[PDB]
Design a protein around this ligand. Structure first.
Ligand code: SRM
Ligand code: SF4
Ligand SMILES: [K+]
Length: 456
């Protein structure tokens, strides 16, 4: 288990060739596993640092995780600056010993693909005239819980306010240090920013950030999100450039019989002009393809099975690694997802909603790596073949799903979803999401204040 520091998930093709080689000749699984934090992982490393170092990559005492950045903004020009800022916060936060690991993102509305509410510190980009002018700071998200422990909880991030671009690093540092100092010194399970905020108060925390940063936040500038999914397929970028996002189930890059995904990405990397972007959804964007290069790239991706069409449901589903490599796994996630969505696809078709989607996620244990706690339908592993079923989140990821059923099996999960989806298909309003609907229809009470009403 080695993991690289790759802000915004942008990786060059040169770097891609060096990791593809290593993955194949020096690991048990021979795979490249894209993670939901925009970086990659090798599994079963049988040196790695000199390999990383040689292509300019570095492997992260440091309580800092990979800083995310919206990978494919609708206003393509905004990416360059937002990415430059992600990269700067990354290097800036690089060595203080934090009580718990600190997660940070730079978001570009209206896309919340980086799933901000799962993170400690978030900078929501505010642009004017195609230029970033500042950020809206949201602080305090975290998804990890412990089964049966009502003192733990998933929490969404809180809005602190707006800050001009210039005050970015000072604020970033102030948040880190204030969590570092105020973080719970007695228990590690209460040491996350989300716990500290609830202990001292958002306002008490905010006032301190201001004092330390040397500024005063301005009121939050309007922003809204419309989704969290990737833009699978070709999208027009700036100039004559195009972006091809490839759907990769579980982000597992390996050559399968008749679907050489791994060789396919290597072939593309060899003729690709720009670079690649690893998404927060475990997919890969072949970025900056000249219009003239579209057919060449598409030809390879197509041959390799990288462009095999899947349903919208599949494209919007996610699972953590879990078995066989995770030591904390309670139930299958990655290896369970595919056949599981095979089942969901059938139920979707049975209900005439095959063109629809439900943000469906499966996490192998309460730690929550699969981000099931921000899904419309989340599966939290409890034991082999068993999961806690949570319902009631939303498409954009701003609501925590309450536990609906506990410790049940797939046949039981499927039987419950069969009935709920059927109701949704027939009783929903125009454009109404499944999560919102379960809450509107009274199928599940909403979680309005995580720290106080997440547990029944
Ligand atoms: C690879 C990935 C899930 C995936 O399939 O993509 C993952 C994989 C692993 N996670 Fe994670 N988590 C991943 C994103 C996160 C997420 C979601 C996110 O960050 O977007 C969270 C939930 C949000 C949160 O932090 O609250 C998450 C919360 C945890 C926790 C709980 C931490 C806590 O505060 O309690 C742990 C366990 C721990 O460290 O105590 C952890 C533990 C672990 C490790 C590294 C297991 C371990 O501690 O030894 C899991 C490794 C499995 C394996 O064999 O590879 N992981 N994990 C993600 C790696 C991200 C990265 O590149 O750094
Ligand atoms: S959620 Fe649990 S099982 Fe899944 S990858 Fe994270 S630690 Fe392992
Ligand atoms: K994926």
């Amino acid at each position: 288990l080695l993991r690289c520091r790759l802000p915004g998930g942008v990786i060059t093709t040169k770097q891609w060739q060096a990791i593809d080689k290593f993955a194949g000749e020096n690991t048990i699984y021979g795979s490249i596993r894209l993670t939901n934090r925009q970086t990659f992982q090798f599994h079963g490393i049988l040196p790695v640092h000199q390999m990383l170092h040689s292509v300019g990559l570095d492997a992260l005492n440091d309580m800092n995780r990979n800083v995310l950045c919206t990978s494919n903004p609708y206003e393509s020009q905004l990416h360059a600056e937002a990415y430059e800022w992600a990269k700067k916060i990354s290097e800036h936060l690089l060595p203080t010993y934090l009580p718990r690991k600190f997660k940070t993102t730079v978001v570009i509305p209206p896309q919340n693909d980086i799933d901000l509410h799962a993170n400690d510190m978030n900078f929501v980009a505010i642009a004017e005239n195609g230029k970033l002018v500042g950020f809206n700071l949201l602080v305090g998200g975290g998804l990890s819980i412990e089964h049966g422990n009502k003192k733990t909880y998933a929490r969404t991030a809180s809005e602190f306010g707006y800050l001009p671009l210039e005050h970015t690093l000072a604020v970033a540092e102030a948040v880190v240090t204030t969590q570092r100092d105020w973080g719970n010194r007695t228990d590690r399970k209460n040491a996350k920013t989300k716990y500290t905020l609830e202990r001292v108060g958002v306002e008490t925390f905010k006032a301190e950030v201001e004092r330390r940063a040397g500024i005063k936040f301005e009121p939050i500038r309007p922003y809204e999100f419309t989704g969290r999914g990737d833009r699978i397929g070709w999208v027009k970028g700036i100039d004559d450039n195009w972006h091809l996002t490839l759907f990769i189930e579980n982000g597992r890059i390996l050559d399968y019989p008749a679907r050489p995904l791994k060789t396919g990405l290597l072939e593309i990397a060899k003729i690709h002009k720009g670079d690649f972007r690893i998404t927060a959804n475990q997919n890969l964007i072949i970025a900056g393809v000249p219009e003239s290069e579209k057919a060449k790239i598409e030809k390879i991706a197509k041959e390799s099975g990288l462009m095999n069409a899947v349903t919208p449901q599949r494209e919007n589903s996610m699972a953590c690694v879990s078995f066989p490599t995770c030591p904390l796994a309670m139930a299958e996630a990655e290896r369970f997802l595919p056949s599981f969505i095979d089942n969901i696809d059938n139920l979707m078709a049975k209900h005439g909603v095959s063109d629809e989607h439900i943000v469906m996620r499966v996490t192998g244990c309460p730690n929550g790596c699969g981000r099931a706690m921000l899904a419309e339908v989340g599966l939290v592993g409890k034991a082999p073949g068993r999961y806690n079923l949570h319902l009631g989140g939303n498409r954009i990821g701003t609501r925590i799903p309450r536990m609906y059923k506990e410790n049940i099996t797939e046949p039981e999960i499927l039987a419950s979803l069969d009935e709920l989806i059927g109701r949704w298909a027939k009783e929903r309003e125009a454009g109404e999401g499944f999560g919102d609907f379960t809450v509107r229809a009274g199928i599940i009470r909403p979680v309005l204040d995580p720290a106080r009403d997440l547990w029944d």
